[PDB]
Amino acid sequence: HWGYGKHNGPEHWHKDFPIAKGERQSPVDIDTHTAKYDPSLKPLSVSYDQATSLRILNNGHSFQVTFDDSQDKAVLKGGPLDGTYRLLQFHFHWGSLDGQGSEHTVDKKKYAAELHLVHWNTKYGDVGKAVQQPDGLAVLGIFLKVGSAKPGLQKVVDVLDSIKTEGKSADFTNFDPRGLLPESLDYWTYPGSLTTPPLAECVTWIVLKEPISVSSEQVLKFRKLNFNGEGEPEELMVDNWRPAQPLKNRQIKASFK
Ligand SMILES: NS(=O)(=O)c1ccc(CCN(Cc2ccco2)C(=O)CN(CCC(=O)O)CCc2ccccc2)cc1
Ligand SMILES: [Zn+2]
């Protein structure tokens, strides 16, 4: 029922999910002058060498690549995190135009898209239990700007024709998510939430400072996806981003001076 349109978009979500007006909702604007360097943060550890991708799918609000999280293969540790977080899936949020699409903003600047690599804290045993914990998930957020192509994204782009409509999926094995990362792991971090219903307040956000560049042709292919299912009226999957939410009683910490 929820979506991104006028009658079911983010301004309506609170009716079914009252935590939408909660104390640690995401995304937020990152005010770079107020975020404070935290020398206590340890270096991020992104260990994706053994990642095992499974499928790519259109779920009606984004497209997502899933991973086998049956074992400690692709894991995120360090930075603000205590313990080990397993990669479950990645997906994107994007705009109808290059000047919008990201969920987080930087000094109110919106990027053309935002990649979310979703990880869960293995101390809770399974992701369903983790989403009920304030420290259950860690999402690594990476901004996309339009410029040069990202070679590591092309395998994704070239299969989107096969999952145009909600409910479609395809095999997507042997995809290496390391090809989606920027050079620098400098980041901002803050406690927040899922940015789609149920908006659970279970996420440590780690947002990389350095965007990746993708080409206009790559992002154009994102915008040809459909929110609707096959055999329904075509509604292009664009502007599937939640806007910045109030920061409230939170501090955004920087890993870098
Ligand atoms: N944009 S964001 O902030 O990065 C972002 C926004 C939403 C989510 C979804 C997180 N959630 C919650 C959810 C609930 C409904 C929809 O979603 C799940 O992952 C749920 N689920 C699917 C995992 C999978 O198979 O992928 C786990 C399976 C499970 C097992 C036992 C009991 C309950 C659930 C992730 C990132
Ligand atoms: Zn997301």
From Swiss-Prot:
<dbReference type="GO" id="GO:0045177">
    <property type="term" value="C:apical part of cell"/>
</dbReference>
<feature type="modified residue" description="Phosphoserine">
    <location>
        <position position="162"/>
    </location>
</feature>
<dbReference type="GO" id="GO:0004064">
    <property type="term" value="F:arylesterase activity"/>
</dbReference>
<dbReference type="InterPro" id="IPR018338">
    <property type="entry name" value="Carbonic_anhydrase_a-class_CS"/>
</dbReference>
<dbReference type="GO" id="GO:0005737">
    <property type="term" value="C:cytoplasm"/>
</dbReference>
<dbReference type="GO" id="GO:2001150">
    <property type="term" value="P:positive regulation of dipeptide transmembrane transport"/>
</dbReference>
<keyword id="KW-0862">Zinc</keyword>
<feature type="site" description="Fine-tunes the proton-transfer properties of H-64">
    <location>
        <position position="4"/>
    </location>
</feature>
<dbReference type="GO" id="GO:0070050">
    <property type="term" value="P:neuron cellular homeostasis"/>
</dbReference>
<feature type="site" description="Fine-tunes the proton-transfer properties of H-64; involved in the binding of some activators, including histamine and L-histidine">
    <location>
        <position position="59"/>
    </location>
</feature>
<comment type="function">
    <text>Catalyzes the reversible hydration of carbon dioxide. Can also hydrate cyanamide to urea. Stimulates the chloride-bicarbonate exchange activity of SLC26A6. Essential for bone resorption and osteoclast differentiation. Involved in the regulation of fluid secretion into the anterior chamber of the eye. Contributes to intracellular pH regulation in the duodenal upper villous epithelium during proton-coupled peptide absorption.</text>
</comment>
<feature type="site" description="Fine-tunes the proton-transfer properties of H-64; involved in the binding of some activators, including histamine and L-histidine">
    <location>
        <position position="64"/>
    </location>
</feature>
<comment type="similarity">
    <text>Belongs to the alpha-carbonic anhydrase family.</text>
</comment>
<feature type="binding site">
    <location>
        <position position="91"/>
    </location>
    <ligand>
        <name>Zn(2+)</name>
    </ligand>
</feature>
<dbReference type="GO" id="GO:0004089">
    <property type="term" value="F:carbonate dehydratase activity"/>
</dbReference>
<keyword id="KW-0987">Osteopetrosis</keyword>
<keyword id="KW-0456">Lyase</keyword>
<dbReference type="GO" id="GO:0038166">
    <property type="term" value="P:angiotensin-activated signaling pathway"/>
</dbReference>
<dbReference type="InterPro" id="IPR036398">
    <property type="entry name" value="CA_dom_sf"/>
</dbReference>
<keyword id="KW-0597">Phosphoprotein</keyword>
<dbReference type="GO" id="GO:0032230">
    <property type="term" value="P:positive regulation of synaptic transmission, GABAergic"/>
</dbReference>
<dbReference type="GO" id="GO:0051453">
    <property type="term" value="P:regulation of intracellular pH"/>
</dbReference>
<feature type="binding site">
    <location>
        <position position="93"/>
    </location>
    <ligand>
        <name>Zn(2+)</name>
    </ligand>
</feature>
<dbReference type="GO" id="GO:2001225">
    <property type="term" value="P:regulation of chloride transport"/>
</dbReference>
<dbReference type="GO" id="GO:0018820">
    <property type="term" value="F:cyanamide hydratase activity"/>
</dbReference>
<keyword id="KW-0225">Disease variant</keyword>
<comment type="subunit">
    <text>Interacts with SLC4A4. Interaction with SLC4A7 regulates SLC4A7 transporter activity. Interacts with SLC26A6 isoform 4 (via C-terminus cytoplasmic domain).</text>
</comment>
<feature type="site" description="Involved in the binding of some activators, including histamine and L-histidine">
    <location>
        <position position="89"/>
    </location>
</feature>
<dbReference type="GO" id="GO:0005886">
    <property type="term" value="C:plasma membrane"/>
</dbReference>
<keyword id="KW-1003">Cell membrane</keyword>
<feature type="active site" description="Proton donor/acceptor">
    <location>
        <position position="61"/>
    </location>
</feature>
<feature type="modified residue" description="Phosphoserine">
    <location>
        <position position="169"/>
    </location>
</feature>
<dbReference type="Pfam" id="PF00194">
    <property type="entry name" value="Carb_anhydrase"/>
</dbReference>
<dbReference type="GO" id="GO:0015670">
    <property type="term" value="P:carbon dioxide transport"/>
</dbReference>
<keyword id="KW-0472">Membrane</keyword>
<feature type="binding site">
    <location>
        <position position="116"/>
    </location>
    <ligand>
        <name>Zn(2+)</name>
    </ligand>
</feature>
<dbReference type="GO" id="GO:0070062">
    <property type="term" value="C:extracellular exosome"/>
</dbReference>
<feature type="binding site">
    <location>
        <begin position="195"/>
        <end position="196"/>
    </location>
    <ligand>
        <name>substrate</name>
    </ligand>
</feature>
<dbReference type="GO" id="GO:0043209">
    <property type="term" value="C:myelin sheath"/>
</dbReference>
<dbReference type="GO" id="GO:0044070">
    <property type="term" value="P:regulation of monoatomic anion transport"/>
</dbReference>
<protein>
    <recommendedName>
        <fullName>Carbonic anhydrase 2</fullName>
        <ecNumber>4.2.1.1</ecNumber>
        <ecNumber>4.2.1.69</ecNumber>
    </recommendedName>
</protein>
<dbReference type="GO" id="GO:0008270">
    <property type="term" value="F:zinc ion binding"/>
</dbReference>
